[PDB]
Amino acid sequence: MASMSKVGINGFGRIGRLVLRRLLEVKSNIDVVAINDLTSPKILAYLLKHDSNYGPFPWSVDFTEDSLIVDGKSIAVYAEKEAKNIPWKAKGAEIIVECTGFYTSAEKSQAHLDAGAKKVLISAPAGEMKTIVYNVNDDTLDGNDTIVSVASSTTNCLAPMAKALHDSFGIEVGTMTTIHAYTGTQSLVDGPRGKDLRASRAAAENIIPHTTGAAKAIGLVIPELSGKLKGHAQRVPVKTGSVTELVSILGKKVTAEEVNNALKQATTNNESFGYTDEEIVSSDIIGSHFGSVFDATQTEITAVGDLQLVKTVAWYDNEYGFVTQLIRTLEKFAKL
Amino acid sequence: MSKVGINGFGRIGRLVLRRLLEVKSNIDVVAINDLTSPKILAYLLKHDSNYGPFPWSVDFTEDSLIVDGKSIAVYAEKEAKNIPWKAKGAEIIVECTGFYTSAEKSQAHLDAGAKKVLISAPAGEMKTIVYNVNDDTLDGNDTIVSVASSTTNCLAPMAKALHDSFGIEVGTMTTIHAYTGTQSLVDGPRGKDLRASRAAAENIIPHTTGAAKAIGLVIPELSGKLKGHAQRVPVKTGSVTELVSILGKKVTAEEVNNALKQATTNNESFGYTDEEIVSSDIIGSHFGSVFDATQTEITAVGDLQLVKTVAWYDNEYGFVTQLIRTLEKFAKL
Amino acid sequence: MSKVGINGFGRIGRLVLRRLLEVKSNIDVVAINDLTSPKILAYLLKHDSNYGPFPWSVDFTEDSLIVDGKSIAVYAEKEAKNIPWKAKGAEIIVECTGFYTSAEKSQAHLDAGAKKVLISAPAGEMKTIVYNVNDDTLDGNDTIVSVASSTTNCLAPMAKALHDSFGIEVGTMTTIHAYTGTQSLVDGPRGKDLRASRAAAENIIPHTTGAAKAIGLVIPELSGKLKGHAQRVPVKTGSVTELVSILGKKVTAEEVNNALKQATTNNESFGYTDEEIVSSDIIGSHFGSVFDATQTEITAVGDLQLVKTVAWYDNEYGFVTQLIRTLEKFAKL
Amino acid sequence: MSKVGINGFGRIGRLVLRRLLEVKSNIDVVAINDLTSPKILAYLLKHDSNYGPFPWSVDFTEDSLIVDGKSIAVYAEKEAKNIPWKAKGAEIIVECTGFYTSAEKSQAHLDAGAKKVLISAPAGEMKTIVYNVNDDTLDGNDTIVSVASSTTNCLAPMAKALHDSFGIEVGTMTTIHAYTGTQSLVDGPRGKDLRASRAAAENIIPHTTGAAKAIGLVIPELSGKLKGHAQRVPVKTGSVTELVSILGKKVTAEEVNNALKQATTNNESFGYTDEEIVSSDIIGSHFGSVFDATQTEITAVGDLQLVKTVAWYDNEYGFVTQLIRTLEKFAKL
Ligand SMILES: NC(=O)c1ccc[n+]([C@@H]2O[C@H](COP(=O)([O-])OP(=O)(O)OC[C@H]3O[C@@H](n4cnc5c(N)ncnc54)[C@H](O)[C@@H]3O)[C@@H](O)[C@H]2O)c1
Ligand SMILES: NC(=O)c1ccc[n+]([C@@H]2O[C@H](COP(=O)([O-])OP(=O)(O)OC[C@H]3O[C@@H](n4cnc5c(N)ncnc54)[C@H](O)[C@@H]3O)[C@@H](O)[C@H]2O)c1
Ligand SMILES: NC(=O)c1ccc[n+]([C@@H]2O[C@H](COP(=O)([O-])OP(=O)(O)OC[C@H]3O[C@@H](n4cnc5c(N)ncnc54)[C@H](O)[C@@H]3O)[C@@H](O)[C@H]2O)c1
Ligand SMILES: NC(=O)c1ccc[n+]([C@@H]2O[C@H](COP(=O)([O-])OP(=O)(O)OC[C@H]3O[C@@H](n4cnc5c(N)ncnc54)[C@H](O)[C@@H]3O)[C@@H](O)[C@H]2O)c1
Ligand SMILES: O=C[C@H](O)COP(=O)(O)O
Ligand SMILES: O=C[C@H](O)COP(=O)(O)O
């Protein structure tokens, strides 16, 4: 009848918790049987139940000394720093959803397979492996894949828009800036944050320039654009909800309307990628069930003779919206 | 001339006084006009959420402020024609209310006893000055002038240099900009601008600006060659402008930055930094604009080249420092 | 009965409609009056910075909103006496503008052909209702009624519960309160209240509230026995109230917590928690007040005892749940 | 003993150095220990989100900072017992990591060859010091001492004045407190304080503090007579403490305020205001506490009387000014 794959989550963080929320929301056939993090079940249960961005959890949440009990289903809880020591076989976890931020390579995520898992989907960029943005390149997946990435939230915002432009007009070259909600990689107060000096600064009190590979590594998702895009971010003080701008030279001359029509078609019957003509703002994207929502109000054609710059803008809930992509990619990946 | 009125003792109006005092200008602020009591303008001048305690004594009477022992009269006239500028002999008006941003509207100050007007904002087709870019275009004959937006003072110095070094054939800007008094505290009507109605401290808010569209008033060769907009975000002040240009020659990142370093050298209006700074590091800047070499980006594919150049600006104090520079000169011609 | 008009389609006005459709009220909102166009009101209704998108369809015409298929008139009359309520037979007016907070002012809606008025704010010495504290004082002869402030709906059930069980001999209240529309986005005049002139999202701002001073309107036996104020702080919504009381009885923490839990049992207005919640956990509460057992504190030396009790409340939606409970009762009398 | 080491070059550690140079102290900071490179510490000192550019020059080598042209050694030892303090002769350690908050734990600094420790936080039953309250208790043979929290530095001088003038029979404190490094940028594990795991800049978060409970260490006669806790809120620094006391005498507001004014006179640690300030007006304060006459409140029902007294504090820089006063005395015993 139905494919009932068994899933473990490594890192029950902002993304790891929303992975469970979303799986339950869509009545997915996957069963989350295990969770690994660095803390007790009490603390994970508190964090699951009460959420500063998405509000109370829509299901019952309890804990024992070794487990979460979520809508009456037990989920084992482990606390292993090192993934080779995670006992994934004890509850039969075959596809690990890897969200700790510390295993973003084939060699590192390998430890999940040494531990007895069968596959791993990485919730972040992970070098030169298969990297999937759903409804842009998920067809490249097949039965032989064992470690896969879904890139960043910014790649999931960028890829759909860039794909549509490429397919319709060509992109000669382009540059991206995402005005991006602050995340857990930043700092609450001015203090050391590894090697990235700017990341050390109080994230709710500054505009902080910040580097991102969403553009530079786009060719993993859209091969014909390898080397053609660059970009960065500015981290700003909103808790989630992000916007991505892109300034392109296209392969032909365009009008605003024409760009917008082409994107509209591309969003039609597309559960991953949305369209809006409304004068929305970042908080309106919070809880979005898209990876990306193209905003036709922000389209801008600048032109002098045959020279033409095209600016296109796309919103994304870098938290929940990404996660809806991650889950779509996970449902497909899990049944191969 | 050295007798000045401030109309609109707001964020910008109060800082104007602070900067004049700070640089010991031989300009005298003799009179102020807002919509409220001297007691409230005193509290506001004395206590600033962004820049701290006023660095001088502030006291009030029923009809005036006492600021470093100097009397400044305070009027509450909604309409500019009703302001008794003549009373204390106010010659040049610094227009910081937002309601008199045209030649015809700011004319009301002239009709009321003033000679010149300097508008703290874009003001249509009018002489519009970024200091150390086109301040040489001002003469004795000028009565009413503008110093554009803070965004224009960030963008213009950067644009001048790029144009002079390499030429800009076309370009589009985005300013990631601190929230201002034109936005809302809570979701609620704010004229026809739908986005401006949204809670400014809890949102990234796209917002129009003509800093790029009206750049031709400041840099005539760039007329019609630029476009842009803003993203208002939740910082109280401190902003940053990104320009993506197609230039007139091939360039390297080192090449772009050296030309900027050059243009910023002995330039009290336009600074340079190669440090990994952030918006709060720009608060209290004495520049109109600070080009940031660390964010320079060349995207090249063949013939085709895109060039991202980024400058910081304190949209409040920094802009003001440009406004005084422009004012001091305007008062002498 | 049945048919309702809203004056002031703001934070509270909009949420009134949302709570009404959420609970599938027989009450029918037939007209809305504000100062702006249907387009803007539609935009604001569709898109909410604190509760997300509106759960129903929202469209408009030049003179109306169309919400979940149902047409609702929009009027733009600044003086209540001119609102044409008789056109759609608006009987009960929900007064959420903040400009008609007295019997004298709100009776204008009656002059405009409404039958009753429910004011969403304190409004002097008139009937004043916190649901499930004193809604039993309502009768068929009440024509103008207040539901006080959000802060009042927070404090009252906490204080009733204390008064009944142990007695409050004297007390003082402090609410750490989300910022509102009455405060300032940037430093600038906000009437005569100096502190409210300061930037709401960048400051802790002391603020007066009448919630405790006027508590005798809801709990007569406490009249004149409480005082209090607010420290307005940078959260968009969600608030918390501390009451420090001298009781008429020696108590333990557990004893105080049992009495509160009993008072919250089967109480749709008044909730209980012993979880380590924070303000955003209350956003979207269906209660006027939620007592927090975790923060209860008994300080004693001999027979001198201080008791601190604390209650959360979503001063936007939580309060509105109370305003709608009051409204549906008002209309069946 | 003019030679000093800093452990924890964080928010407090770095401001400790800012302040010593601000007051031209003859204390000599010779070594710093933390967990990171001199590059990163130099950046953090140069550029500060709350207080802006360091007023003196800042460079670095692969094992040192160079501050105002003067060399400071930089170690990276996570266990204080391994810090080579004898290399450059650091005889007094200013312990600002938060991991050494007891005599047991800070004894390590003495094992590592230093002679005294001054802990920038509460640290159990040890000599704990609020400057201009109990710095008379410091003694030649004290080797490990505390300056408690900044909240203790806000509370204690207010309670001292009240105790001295009227007696405090019993009292309870609530501080409305800026967020700090012990909280979280996003929702996630934060040891075993559940509330501490919550986004600090998007929530009002209750949080325990022993300021009141451990006041007996600073004012022996108030031992056991106070309790309290904090509400952590989204402002970056700048905090306020409320205290509700039952006093030993019957009093008016003018009387309380006048007592407080007398205690603040010529007191470099304890300030006074009747101005209508807000939190950002305390950022940069050179007091440990500034008492605010405007929020004084007497609640009375015959015999019974509650007194609410409120004091501001810059939990970072203000506190630091007290830490430095105490350090300067300590080095001369
Ligand atoms: N905006 C976003 O938040 C966002 C969007 C897209 C992708 N991502 C990616 O997803 C991953 C997680 O992001 P996040 O914001 O949820 O981080 P987070 O800190 O919110 O969550 C990380 C979790 O992992 C745990 N952890 C840390 N090291 C661990 C280890 N060795 N083993 C097990 N658990 C460990 C932490 O306790 C925490 O609960 C990152 O790779 C990030 O780039 C984040
Ligand atoms: N804040 C910035 O970033 C910034 C930067 C550059 C330029 N400006 C420009 O300067 C002007 C003022 O900006 P702001 O941010 O200080 O605005 P603001 O809202 O802080 O201040 C406006 C002031 O003018 C007063 N006012 C309003 N109507 C008036 C009238 N009819 N007569 C007298 N006074 C009146 C208000 O009471 C207030 O004190 C605007 O045109 C704006 O575009 C602002
Ligand atoms: N936000 C809260 O926490 C809260 C909680 C409880 C009660 N209240 C009370 O509810 C009332 C409104 O609060 P709010 O936060 O919704 O205010 P708000 O400013 O969000 O909305 C007021 C609305 O009324 C409109 N308005 C102003 N003058 C008007 C007039 N003459 N005619 C018609 N409409 C007019 C405004 O345009 C706006 O849409 C106030 O009395 C307030 O005390 C507010
Ligand atoms: N910020 C305030 O409001 C405030 C006020 C008064 C007292 N304090 C106290 O002072 C101390 C520090 O507070 P803060 O806000 O500066 O914290 P912080 O996190 O900003 O500073 C801590 C510093 O210590 C370093 N550190 C951590 N572990 C270490 C170790 N094992 N060895 C050496 N260095 C280490 C960190 O890298 C960081 O630079 C705490 O005890 C705190 O209670 C803080
Ligand atoms: O305590 C007062 C109310 O809850 C909110 O008041 P306001 O919205 O009128 O400022
Ligand atoms: O009140 C200030 C305290 O001393 C600081 O507590 P903290 O350890 O959370 O910074």
Numbering used by the authors:
A (entry chain Q): -2 to 333
B (entry chain R), C (entry chain O), D (entry chain P): 1 to 333
Give the published text:
The enzymatic activity of wild-type EcGAPDH1 was 3.84 × 104 times higher than that of C150S and 8.13 × 103 times higher than that of H177A. The analysis of the Q subunit of C150S.NAD.G3P and the O subunit of the thioacyl intermediate revealed that there are three differences. First, O1 of G3P is opposite to His177 in terms of its thioacyl intermediate structure, while it is oriented towards His177 in C150S.NAD.G3P. Second, the phosphate of G3P of the thioacyl intermediate is positioned in the “new Pi” site, while it is in the “Ps” site in C150S.NAD.G3P. Third, the loop that contains amino acid residues 208–215 is in conformation I in C150S.NAD.G3P, while it has two conformations in the thioacyl intermediate. In C150S.NAD.G3P, two hydrogen bonds are formed between O1 of G3P and Oγ of Thr209, while the O2 of G3P with the Nε of His177 strengthens the aldehyde form. However, these bonds do not exist in the hydrated form.
